[PDB]
Amino acid sequence: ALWQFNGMIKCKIPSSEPLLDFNNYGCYCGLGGSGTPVDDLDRCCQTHDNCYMQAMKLDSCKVLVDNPYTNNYSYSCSNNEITCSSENNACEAFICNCDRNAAICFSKVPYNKEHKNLDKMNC
Ligand SMILES: [Ca+2]
Ligand SMILES: [Ca+2]
Ligand SMILES: [Cl-]
C-alpha cells in the first residue's frame, strides 16, 4: 500500500518527503505517466508504473480489492535496507517488490528539481 511505499522510501532516503518529492516529477512520477522519461529518477517511476500495471493483472491479485495503492503487505527496514517478508501472499509479495525496487532506484539516482511540475508537452 502507499503508506508502506512511503515507508520504504524513507528507509532508503531518510531526508526525503516522499509524497512531496516524488510526486509530480518528470513524465512518470505521480499518478499516471507516459512518454519519454526525462532523467533516471523519472525512469525509476516509469519502471514502478509498469510494475503496478503488472500487479493489477496478476491472477493472484483480485481486481480492485487487491490494488497496489491500498493492499498492505509486510516488509521491514534494517540499516536502510528493505526486506519483503516471506509472510506475504503472492499478490502482496509482487507489490512489495515493485515498491522495494523503486525505493532503491530512487536512492541511487540524482534529484533534479527543474523536473518538478513538467507540462505534458515535454513527454
Ligand atoms: Ca506514474
Ligand atoms: Ca494485503
Ligand atoms: Cl534495500
Swiss-Prot record:
On whether Calcium is a keyword of this UniProt record, the answer is yes
Q: Which residues are recorded as binding Ca(2+)?
A: Y28, G30, G32, D49
Q: Which residues are catalytic?
A: H48, D99
Q: Would I find Coiled coil among this entry's keywords?
A: no
Assigned EC number: 3.1.1.4
Free-text comment on the cofactor: Binds 1 Ca(2+) ion per subunit.
Q: Top-level EC class, please?
A: hydrolase
Briefly state the modifications made to the protein after translation. Answer: Activated by trypsin cleavage in the duodenum. Can also be activated by thrombin or autocatalytically.
Which molecular-function annotation in GO is an example for this chain? signaling receptor binding
Q: What cofactors are annotated for this protein?
A: Ca(2+)
The compartments listed are: Secreted
Q: What is its main location?
A: secreted
Keywords from the named record: Autocatalytic cleavage, Calcium, Disulfide bond, Hydrolase, Lipid metabolism, Metal-binding, Phospholipid metabolism, Pyrrolidone carboxylic acid, Secreted, Signal, Zymogen
- Name the reaction it catalyses: a 1,2-diacyl-sn-glycero-3-phosphocholine + H2O = a 1-acyl-sn-glycero-3-phosphocholine + a fatty acid + H(+); 1,2-ditetradecanoyl-sn-glycero-3-phosphocholine + H2O = 1-tetradecanoyl-sn-glycero-3-phosphocholine + tetradecanoate + H(+); 1,2-dihexadecanoyl-sn-glycero-3-phosphocholine + H2O = 1-hexadecanoyl-sn-glycero-3-phosphocholine + hexadecanoate + H(+); 1-hexadecanoyl-2-(9Z-octadecenoyl)-sn-glycero-3-phosphocholine + H2O = 1-hexadecanoyl-sn-glycero-3-phosphocholine + (9Z)-octadecenoate + H(+)
Name the domain of life this protein comes from.
Eukaryota
Q: List the disulfide bonds.
A: C11-C77, C27-C123, C29-C45, C44-C105, C51-C98, C61-C91, C84-C96
* GO biological processes: antibacterial humoral response; antimicrobial humoral immune response mediated by antimicrobial peptide; arachidonate secretion; defense response to Gram-positive bacterium; fatty acid biosynthetic process; innate immune response in mucosa; lipid catabolic process; phosphatidylcholine metabolic process
One GO CC term, this protein: extracellular space
Q: Which family does it belong to?
A: Belongs to the phospholipase A2 family.
The role this protein plays is: Secretory calcium-dependent phospholipase A2 that primarily targets dietary phospholipids in the intestinal tract. Hydrolyzes the ester bond of the fatty acyl group attached at sn-2 position of phospholipids (phospholipase A2 activity) with preference for phosphatidylethanolamines and phosphatidylglycerols over phosphatidylcholines. May play a role in the biosynthesis of N-acyl ethanolamines that regulate energy metabolism and inflammation in the intestinal tract.
- What name does UniProt use for this protein? Phospholipase A2
Source organism of the structure: Bos taurus (Bovine)
Q: Which gene encodes it?
A: PLA2G1B
Residue numbers of the full-length protein present here: 23 to 145 of 145
